[PDB]
Amino acid sequence: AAAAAANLNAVRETMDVLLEISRILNTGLDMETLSICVRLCEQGINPEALSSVIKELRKATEALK
Amino acid sequence: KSPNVLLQNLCCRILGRSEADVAQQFQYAVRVIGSNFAPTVERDEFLVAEKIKKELIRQRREADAALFSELHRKLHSQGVLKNKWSILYLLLSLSEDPR
């Protein structure tokens, strides 16, 4: 398939758009993890729950520093 | 991919641990994520975009405020994002001033 891979290039293009959005906002997230988050909202999820998850997980790496 | 298993990849990305190493963080993740697996309303990415503009206003980047309307358009242009509201709410919730 050829059109099914140009859509994957399209996914990477929006992923770089969200890369610029992540740096101007100063988030710690990288590209692989945001693709995991994209799949999470494919199944449907509260962003308020994902932010509480990540707002526990990042400042539970500051408790073993 | 299951709802349950994608959070262990979230745990393997933030922490340097596997799902077979830590189960205490992943437990609170399953507790919070599950039973709250439904978005609060249908999409309003425009309302969240006008608050991401308020973050770009806080830095006297008004040329990047004019870039944001063309960056917010590409999300709709490819259409691979189902909840454009959720990921913008998620980024906006983690907003810190570069400052």
Place this chain on the structure above:
Amino acid sequence: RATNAQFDSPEILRRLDVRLLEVSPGDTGWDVFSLDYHVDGPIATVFTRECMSHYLRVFNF
């Protein structure tokens, strides 16, 4: 007060006042400073706001 500007009218020193640049993670005051002359009468019909912008750009240089 100490310099020659003291013997100039209090109105036009009053209309010129300080301003800054909204913040960024590499702030220096040499990066972040401006003066603002702002309109206090009908002079907006003479001085546009984008004219103050070009004013501030050549001021930055």
